Design a protein around this ligand. Structure first.
Ligand SMILES: CC(=O)Nc1nnc(S(N)(=O)=O)s1
Ligand SMILES: CC(=O)Nc1nnc(S(N)(=O)=O)s1
Ligand SMILES: [Zn+2]
Ligand SMILES: [Zn+2]
Lengths: 223, 223
């Protein structure tokens, strides 16, 4: 089984299972979003409205706290119609901006009818507490397992008002590290209280962010 | 052995050898350079001066006619210092522009000190004959083999005056189809005479262009 340290750490994920060959390729995530290879461009506007997920499932799978939604929220971008499947968290953040780590990163995982994946990343900096985050972190089991949250979560409240973003072609950040992933990282971080961030970290017991990967021949676009 | 048709055709390259696993991944070349996923941006200017290659080696390797240069022509771009190694040809072209094929495409293959690859592609449309092309095609062996050209080739004469270009992250277009390749396709095609184009095609005996591949989560930048 893979982990974020030791023999089964990120550096040896590709050795754990034949299906993890992707982890050693040339278009991996996360990456350092650097001005060195970031270019500004007129990009498609992000149109999403994740109203609210009613009675979503909160899962502790040992590697993160994930929320599986029952609704069918659509993300239409780059000629595809992706459907939100779940969002989860990483602490510290996986992506960095000019070398800077944020204390928390949320990933909204979408998939289209053909299995294509798009992930929207949201950075969280310490500050005013976020209402929705308590619903997730305080109702997450401390041990591996799932639980149905008796209530609803306003996902829009887990997103910044302005949705300018960075985008690049990458991969899943945990085995099998499949590539061909469409990454959309919102430029504006929102806030989470120190207690919310520490609660998540204390549940995980360890950092669950994959080291940044070489950008190689890719450029990152910024809207 | 792989080919451009039959059992060993492009569709089954990945089955020929374990090392060809790349041919089935998510960041393959060539691609259709489509306005649907092409974005304009301020890109690094292309600074290259491939003066002339003296006594280069002309090789017919059965899949193309390739010219190996002895000089050390540098291509400095995207934070790397690539060195020109050789240029070769494909007929019809490999890349297309909004679905349009050109009769001929030239590839200038560069590699840096770490093995990183950058390929500059040049489209040729039928028209005024190109002086340099005769040096290559008329001196290429009709059967597999190499030969040293007794003369010099002005590579700059194989490039358009204006060097605006498209760029994207891709792969080699023949096995092993390694990814992480930096592609730079010059937007302006130059000309080759119908006879020059047919001479190359008659030597090859068959089309030697790989089918275009899915762009997947990549965008193509245009300077
Ligand atoms: C089952 C599933 O979604 N797996 C993922 N692996 N990595 C992901 S991430 N961090 O790139 O969003 S999602
Ligand atoms: C040895 C070598 O250079 N191999 C190549 N395979 N494909 C290439 S291409 N068409 O992408 O320039 S170069
Ligand atoms: Zn994630
Ligand atoms: Zn080629």
């Amino acid at each position: 089984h893979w982990s974020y340290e030791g023999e089964n750490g990120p550096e040896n994920w590709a050795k754990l299972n034949p299906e993890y060959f992707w982890c050693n390729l040339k278009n991996q995530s996360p990456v350092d979003i650097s001005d060195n290879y970031k270019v500004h461009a007129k990009l498609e506007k992000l149109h999403i409205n994740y109203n609210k997920a009613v009675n979503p499932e909160i899962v502790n799978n040992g590697h993160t706290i994930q929320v599986n939604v029952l609704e069918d929220f659509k993300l239409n971008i780059k000629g595809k119609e992706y459907h939100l499947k779940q969002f989860h968290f990483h602490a510290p953040s996986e992506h960095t901006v000019n070398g800077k780590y944020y204390p928390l990163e949320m990933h909204l995982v979408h998939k289209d009818k053909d299995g294509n994946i798009a992930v929207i990343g949201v950075f969280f900096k310490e500050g005013k507490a976020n209402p929705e985050l308590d619903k997730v972190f305080k109702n997450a089991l401390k041990e591996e397992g799932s639980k149905v949250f008796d209530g609803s979560i306003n996902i829009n409240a887990l997103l910044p008002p302005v949705k300018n973003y960075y985008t690049y072609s990458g991969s899943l950040t945990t085995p099998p590290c499949t590539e061909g992933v469409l990454w959309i990282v919102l430029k504006q971080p929102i806030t989470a209280s120190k207690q919310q961030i520490e609660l998540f970290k204390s549940i995980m017991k360890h950092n669950n962010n994959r080291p940044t990967q070489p950008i190689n021949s890719r450029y990152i676009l910024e809207s």
